[PDB]
């Protein structure tokens, strides 16, 4: 299938409680493989998946150095951001970063990403062209001007088209037994009377990977989008994910309802109904 590598970085200031904490977590698809936390007693790039453990000492200490420097960079960014928005030194603020690359089944670059949010709001993003920026406001325009002057986009493009794609391909090869294995959902439909007049049908999907899934209910073949309660896809803790969708149905009308499941691990999509 297609695959992604993404780093998710969070830097958060905490006036009166030391310097801003920096945490970076790296993923291939829905599998975390590294973490770095400046609050760790001994901050270092640490493995969080078995297939990365085979990388030698040079991998770990080179990445550790990048992340230690990134901690300082993000602190610089937070200081600058506070100024751009004329903010007090009393408050806590958050800078988030997402960067990395997507590749197709053949390992070719689909696109790169490098974007930032300040206090939960999009701030600046590298455009899909990997050459230009989109700034959200006049503060981000200051960053944009600075990054244009320093030709930052050219450095990011080189990273995203080269290093990122090269390492993603390497990770996919080393972890092929897991990263390139889609585990289909185990499914069932439960039935819960709520009154004499109505009952809940709940369609379950358990044990699937990756997280992307489509779970829908139909009544007489029509999608019940508005009337379906759909919980957020949630991690089980064993790499897999879970999800359910529920509809309230009139008593006696259960067989008019079908649950439909689409997932990469399924040979064919599923159509389930309540099986009393």
């Amino acid at each position: 299938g297609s695959h992604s590598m993404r780093y998710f970085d969070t830097a958060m200031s905490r006036p009166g409680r030391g310097e801003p904490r920096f945490i970076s977590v790296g993923y291939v698809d829905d599998t975390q493989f590294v973490r770095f936390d400046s609050d760790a007693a001994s901050p270092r790039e640490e493995p969080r998946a078995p297939w990365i453990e085979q990388e030698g000492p040079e991998y770990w200490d080179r990445n550790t150095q990048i992340f230690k420097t990134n901690t300082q960079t993000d602190r610089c960014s937070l200081r600058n951001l506070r100024g751009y928005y004329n903010q007090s030194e009393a408050g806590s603020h958050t800078l988030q970063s997402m960067y990395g690359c997507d590749v197709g089944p053949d390992g070719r670059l689909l696109r790169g990403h490098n974007q930032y949010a300040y206090d939960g709001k999009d701030y600046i993003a590298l455009n899909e062209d990997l050459r230009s920026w989109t700034a959200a406001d006049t503060a981000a325009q200051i960053t944009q001007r600075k990054w244009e002057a320093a030709r930052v986009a050219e450095q990011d493009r080189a990273y995203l088209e080269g290093t990122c794609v090269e390492w993603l391909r390497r990770y996919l090869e080393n972890g092929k037994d897991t990263l390139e294995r889609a585990d289909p959902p185990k499914t069932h439909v439960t039935h819960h009377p709520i009154s004499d007049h109505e009952a809940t049908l709940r369609c379950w999907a358990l044990g699937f990977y990756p997280a992307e899934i489509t779970l829908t209910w139909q009544r007489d073949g029509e999608d019940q989008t508005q009337d379906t309660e759909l919980v957020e896809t949630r991690p089980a803790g064993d790499r897999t994910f879970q999800k359910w969708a529920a509809v309230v149905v009139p008593s006696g009308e259960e067989q008019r309802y079908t649950c439909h499941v689409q997932h990469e691990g399924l040979p064919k999509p599923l159509t389930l109904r309540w099986e009393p």
């Binding site: 990048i66 990134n70 951001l81 970063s97 930052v152 450095q155 290093t163």
Partner: peptide, 9 residues
């Protein structure tokens, strides 16, 4: 290295 060098905003 695998991780990306970041730039100050």
């Amino acid at each position: 290295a695998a991780a990306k060098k970041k730039y100050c905003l």
